[PDB]
Design an enzyme around this catalytic site. Structure first.
Site, mmCIF file in Angstrom:
data_model
loop_
_atom_site.group_PDB
_atom_site.id
_atom_site.type_symbol
_atom_site.label_atom_id
_atom_site.label_comp_id
_atom_site.label_asym_id
_atom_site.label_seq_id
_atom_site.Cartn_x
_atom_site.Cartn_y
_atom_site.Cartn_z
ATOM 1 N N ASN A 1 1.130 -1.527 0.210
ATOM 2 C CA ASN A 1 0.508 0.152 -0.005
ATOM 3 C C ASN A 1 0.993 1.237 -0.151
ATOM 4 O O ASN A 1 0.284 2.057 -0.357
ATOM 5 C CB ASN A 1 -1.089 0.174 1.000
ATOM 6 N N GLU B 1 4.643 -8.912 -2.584
ATOM 7 C CA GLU B 1 3.673 -9.486 -4.035
ATOM 8 C C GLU B 1 3.838 -7.830 -5.092
ATOM 9 O O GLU B 1 3.427 -7.935 -6.269
ATOM 10 C CB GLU B 1 3.400 -10.845 -4.304
ATOM 11 N N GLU C 1 4.477 -3.679 12.390
ATOM 12 C CA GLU C 1 3.429 -2.253 12.592
ATOM 13 C C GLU C 1 2.497 -2.760 11.779
ATOM 14 O O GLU C 1 2.596 -2.954 10.159
ATOM 15 C CB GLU C 1 4.634 -1.327 12.524
ATOM 16 N N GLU D 1 -10.251 -5.168 10.220
ATOM 17 C CA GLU D 1 -9.547 -3.679 9.036
ATOM 18 C C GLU D 1 -10.476 -4.404 7.970
ATOM 19 O O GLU D 1 -10.003 -5.672 7.129
ATOM 20 C CB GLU D 1 -8.581 -3.739 9.701
ATOM 21 N N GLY E 1 -2.363 10.771 6.504
ATOM 22 C CA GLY E 1 -1.002 11.542 5.675
ATOM 23 C C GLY E 1 -0.199 11.725 6.766
ATOM 24 O O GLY E 1 0.850 13.478 6.447
HETATM 25 N N1 NAD Z 1 0.909 0.007 10.794
HETATM 26 C C1 NAD Z 1 1.258 0.582 9.866
HETATM 27 O O1 NAD Z 1 2.444 1.556 9.902
HETATM 28 C C2 NAD Z 1 1.072 0.421 8.469
HETATM 29 C C3 NAD Z 1 1.300 0.157 7.540
HETATM 30 C C4 NAD Z 1 0.255 0.101 5.816
HETATM 31 C C5 NAD Z 1 0.073 -0.735 6.489
HETATM 32 N N2 NAD Z 1 -0.372 -1.822 7.266
HETATM 33 C C6 NAD Z 1 -1.035 -2.592 7.001
HETATM 34 O O2 NAD Z 1 -0.425 -3.627 5.997
HETATM 35 C C7 NAD Z 1 -1.676 -4.220 5.682
HETATM 36 C C8 NAD Z 1 -1.788 -4.725 3.737
HETATM 37 O O3 NAD Z 1 -0.849 -5.104 3.723
HETATM 38 P P1 NAD Z 1 -0.100 -6.062 2.943
HETATM 39 O O4 NAD Z 1 -1.594 -6.743 2.122
HETATM 40 O O5 NAD Z 1 0.897 -6.210 1.792
HETATM 41 O O6 NAD Z 1 -0.225 -6.838 3.961
HETATM 42 P P2 NAD Z 1 0.492 -8.750 4.510
HETATM 43 O O7 NAD Z 1 0.411 -9.437 5.510
HETATM 44 O O8 NAD Z 1 -1.055 -9.371 3.693
HETATM 45 O O9 NAD Z 1 1.968 -9.025 3.490
HETATM 46 C C9 NAD Z 1 2.765 -8.085 4.068
HETATM 47 C C10 NAD Z 1 4.233 -8.217 3.810
HETATM 48 O O10 NAD Z 1 4.173 -9.745 4.461
HETATM 49 C C11 NAD Z 1 4.459 -10.574 3.664
HETATM 50 N N3 NAD Z 1 3.953 -11.924 3.642
HETATM 51 C C12 NAD Z 1 2.738 -12.394 4.149
HETATM 52 N N4 NAD Z 1 2.759 -13.177 4.845
HETATM 53 C C13 NAD Z 1 3.695 -13.875 5.186
HETATM 54 C C14 NAD Z 1 4.590 -14.691 5.941
HETATM 55 N N5 NAD Z 1 3.033 -15.713 7.176
HETATM 56 N N6 NAD Z 1 5.746 -14.556 6.682
HETATM 57 C C15 NAD Z 1 6.388 -13.208 6.340
HETATM 58 N N7 NAD Z 1 5.941 -12.612 5.878
HETATM 59 C C16 NAD Z 1 4.912 -12.683 5.011
HETATM 60 C C17 NAD Z 1 4.346 -10.329 1.891
HETATM 61 O O11 NAD Z 1 4.877 -10.831 1.522
HETATM 62 C C18 NAD Z 1 4.031 -8.869 2.194
HETATM 63 O O12 NAD Z 1 5.500 -8.280 1.864
HETATM 64 C C19 NAD Z 1 -3.064 -3.717 5.954
HETATM 65 O O13 NAD Z 1 -3.414 -4.404 7.061
HETATM 66 C C20 NAD Z 1 -2.896 -2.289 6.635
HETATM 67 O O14 NAD Z 1 -3.342 -2.252 8.302
HETATM 68 C C21 NAD Z 1 -0.209 -1.428 8.135
HETATM 69 C C1 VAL Z 2 2.824 6.047 4.749
HETATM 70 C C2 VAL Z 2 1.277 5.986 5.599
HETATM 71 C C3 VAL Z 2 0.693 5.339 6.824
HETATM 72 C C4 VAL Z 2 0.985 7.649 5.746
HETATM 73 N N1 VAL Z 2 2.126 8.283 6.276
HETATM 74 C C5 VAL Z 2 -0.211 8.078 6.467
HETATM 75 O O1 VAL Z 2 -0.665 8.244 7.775
HETATM 76 O O2 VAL Z 2 -1.205 8.059 5.989
#
Ligand code: NAD
Ligand code: VAL
Ligand code: NAD
Ligand code: VAL
Ligand code: NA
Ligand code: NA
Lengths: 516, 516
Positions: free
Chosen positions: B184, B210, B288, B417, B477
């Protein structure tokens, strides 16, 4: 709040008649109090149980120093409720108010220092100076963390401004956590692990080690007298694998502050990584575990100075320190001169009941004695026994200062933490090989180098991979404020005690923006 | 090193003809390169594999935007060898030299910002301003961490002096670790999580999501041109549960830096707590995770300002933000006025191919589309659908801005979520109940309050338990430096990105005493 700059509490040496007199009276009164019973402390009150914990005198284990109540799951649940309830308001105290409370507790502890030292003498078999250092370190943690906590006060975070907005980041405490403490520094480490988190607004359930429950209770007497609000600190003497594990694994414990064996630290760190049913956070676990600490001596060293520092480091409190020199790594030119001097010094060490202020008192318990003697038997088949290796006569758990030499670097006695008065001497070619051998253990806690060669010292500064390194001095007795204490590798999570960074471990950060 | 004080990279708004012209040119260049294959990057070289990863345009999924190599276990091992070999010397670079390297990378990234933004548009379906904000944030992380790293340079630790001794405490990097990144913010978060650890002397194996492998490769082109020494940064596109998990579980991985879903974060944190066979440290894992973020509006608010902020927060990048407003909590007096305004604004939002700069592009993938549509079905059973709730015409994964009202606070759509353009509206009695509802989720990432009442804002400052709280503005943001970013509870470990504290997470401390 404005107080004098931090200074370390002086360690009593008992070289004045005044100090001897005070200590003799303190020991007499503690001895006269043998058999006293101490309850749990939960939500601001002393709470007794049917079951008890018994604390023996390791110098004469037919003698019961005292007993305490024993916490099981119900008492753990009561303490959790008290601690979370307290957290709700304790977190909102101005930092200055919390820091003043610590300073009061420090003043009360200082006024009871001889009594607390005498309690360590009888309960865990410290000689007088080891007992004094332990208590002084506890006072230092309180004084130091009281001051350090002010550096985190609202709103402490440096942020970049933005037009038309106030941006304010600040720290808040985590919640109610468990502190699980060892028997070897049961005033200093017990106090430090409790008061650091508490200083910045957390609440704590404290689980003293089984062998040190009485002195843990006396620390709680001080907390109660100081006036911590009900629930802020709670005292749960009990069995580690029972009540300790119960709290570690609990969905409502926010953090775990642990000091103890690697074996236990590993279980705790693993358990902390799991989401217990209904848990709503990622647990923080700080685990400070053992060491297999080496002193290196090269051919340029002051050999007399080295021998004295090795003997202090190896045999101080019977080698029952995570910081103790359990390995002596000697380059070829240092081998004979240093070993001869170490053997000469160590063979002169007195061993006996701790109250007599011997060089060595007993090891802490029958189980510790068993383990140390077992490692001695192992060592006899790995290296060459050249001093001691025997239990001494008497009811107390007295073990002679022991030295093995020509020990293979990969030998069990050169790798595994024995935690007794057992030194393994390793002969190496040069300083390069000394460093290789020093680093080749699973641990990384303390280390030392005796050398006059600047280039060897500065090389070790860069490459002797331990968290606490000392040149031309003993490797034990890290002072609060002076030497941030904590290790690398399987010596733990590197939570540096007696350092500003320690308190950050028990805080989380909030960032709040108002657009006007 | 002396550079200008940190400032945030301006986010392009495309209000000028030149900026639009430049974007059109960049979009053309990027699409002319849709044929490209991007190998792995290991030990300073691009290394190809037999198998490949395919990246699709979510606005036209029959269109391939690129392919990359696919890392398996062998490539993970190669990357590990390279990263540990590089760590040995990279750790010894003066901090000023490491910081200059980041500054170079930032300058190169800034020079390629339109190309990167255009890649975000085509690869992950960001509109123009969302793409610009993402790239500008990545630049910000590099500039900010370059500067912040100098605050930790040798010897940075404040300690208490002792007579006759030098006492020196200082930070050292941990080693080689793995960075596992989301789709994202696949420039900003990918870049930040890599360059923070690297800045202070760690080495990194980076595993892009991916769905964002191509833009991740382009970030690596920048690292390669900047001239990071071989093995310092490594690029391993591949499957999360394969190569990602393999690295997480590996005994030779020193730390894990993860941003992604709670489901995965929980597995990673649990795995990190285990001692893998032969492992010789306690792994650090920073995770995170998601949010279920609310904006509260009370009857004192500027309702038009609130409605605008809510729509920006809820539907910016199709709600696929961990910071996205997915809950709108309205007090009785605010309910009708705010909801009517939100509906009016949201119904005017455009949805279509991202390159046309619509208000909303597509969700990122067929899987995301399926997930969001399934939650819409659940929502129809829990609340009242009042806007959207439908897939829109075209191969692209276009989903209409969606609003559910009369949603129970404990409904699945009010707790889980969804990560799509789906807003759940919750009616409450007063501000106190608003805060209760705001707090009653497993999460605690972002939150917002629209209100003119000072007492309500300051009450929320103290009690709305989220890591990033915003008053009378959007809750998305967060800007590097300005708003340290990271949450509480199951939103993760509170590793505050874009803050001085972030870099300390990738350091350990050594204390070295010399007695003269
Ligand atoms: N807290 C934050 O700063 C923050 C910021 C951006 C996104 N997010 C979270 O990201 C999520 C969306 O992103 P996403 O769909 O890429 O997340 P995801 O958990 O599906 O995957 C994230 C990463 O982890 C890898 N992954 C998946 N399964 C794994 C495993 N079992 N072991 C090791 N790695 C693995 C994926 O290939 C990818 O690189 C949402 O839940 C969102 O809230 C959190
Ligand atoms: C990268 C992302 C988490 C952005 N800084 C936001 O707060 O939306
Ligand atoms: N790194 C340091 O700062 C440092 C300092 C002092 C002592 N130590 C280590 O402490 C060890 C000696 O202390 P010890 O014998 O008290 O250690 P220990 O691990 O046996 O016990 C320590 C504490 O943990 C409790 N405990 C035991 N099993 C438990 C379990 N499964 N779950 C939860 N709690 C449990 C005990 O009751 C005690 O309170 C040595 O290895 C020494 O190196 C380390
Ligand atoms: C408490 C103990 C670990 C002491 N500070 C030492 O370094 O020996
Ligand atoms: Na005892
Ligand atoms: Na894509």
């Amino acid at each position: 709040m404005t107080v004098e700059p931090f200074r370390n509490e002086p360690i009593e040496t008992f070289q004045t008649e005044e100090a001897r007199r005070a200590m003799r009276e303190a020991l007499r009164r503690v001895r006269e109090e043998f058999g006293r019973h101490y309850p749990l402390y939960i939500g601001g009150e002393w709470v007794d149980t049917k079951e008890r914990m018994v604390s023996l005198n390791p110098s004469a284990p037919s003698e019961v120093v005292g007993t305490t109540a024993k916490a099981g799951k119900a008492e753990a649940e009561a303490a959790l409720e008290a601690a979370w309830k307290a957290f709700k308001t304790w977190k909102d105290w101005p930092q200055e108010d919390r820091s003043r409370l610590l300073l009061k507790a420090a003043a009360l502890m200082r006024r009871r220092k001889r009594e607390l030292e005498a309690t360590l003498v009888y309960e865990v078999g410290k000689n007088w100076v080891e007992a004094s250092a332990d208590v002084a370190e506890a006072i230092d943690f309180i004084e130091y963390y009281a001051r350090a906590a002010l550096r985190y006060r609202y709103p402490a975070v440096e942020v970049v401004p933005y037009p038309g907005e106030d941006n304010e980041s600040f720290y808040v405490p985590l919640g109610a956590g468990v502190v699980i403490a060892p028997w070897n520094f049961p005033v200093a480490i017990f106090t430090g692990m409790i008061v650091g988190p508490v200083a910045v607004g957390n609440t704590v359930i404290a689980k003293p080690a089984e062998d040190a429950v009485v002195v843990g209770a006396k620390v709680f007497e001080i907390f109660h007298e100081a006036g911590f609000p009900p629930g802020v600190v709670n005292f749960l003497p009990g069995v580690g694998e029972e009540v300790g594990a119960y709290l570690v694994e609990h969905p409502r414990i926010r953090f775990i502050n642990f000091t103890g064996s690697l074996e236990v630290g590993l279980k705790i760190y693993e358990a902390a990584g799991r989401l217990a049913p209904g848990q709503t956070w990622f647990k923080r676990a700080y685990v400070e575990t053992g060491g297999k600490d080496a002193i290196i001596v090269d051919e340029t060293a002051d050999f007399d100075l080295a021998a004295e520092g090795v003997v202090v480091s190896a045999y101080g409190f019977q080698g029952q320190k995570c910081s103790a020199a359990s390995r002596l790594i000697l380059t070829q030119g240092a081998y004979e001169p240093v070993l001869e001097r170490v053997l000469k010094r160590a063979e002169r060490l007195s061993v006996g009941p701790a109250e007599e202020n011997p060089d060595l008192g007993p090891v802490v318990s029958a189980e510790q004695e068993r383990k140390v003697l077992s490692y001695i038997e192992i060592g006899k088949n790995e290296g060459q026994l050249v001093l001691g290796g025997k239990r001494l006569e008497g009811e107390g758990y007295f073990i002679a200062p022991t030295v093995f030499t020509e020990v293979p670097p990969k030998a069990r006695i050169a790798q595994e933490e024995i935690f007794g008065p057992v030194l393994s001497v390793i002969r190496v070619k040069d300083f390069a090989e000394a460093l290789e051998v020093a680093n080749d253990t699973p641990y990384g806690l303390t280390g030392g180098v005796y050398s006059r060669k600047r280039e060897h010292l500065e090389w070790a500064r860069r490459e002797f991979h331990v968290g606490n390194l000392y040149f031309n001095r003993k490797i034990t007795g890290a002072l609060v404020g002076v030497q941030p204490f904590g290790g690398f590798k399987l010596s733990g999570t590197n939570a540096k005690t007696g350092a500003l960074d320690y308190l950050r471990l028990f805080l989380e950060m909030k960032a709040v923006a108002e657009r006007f």
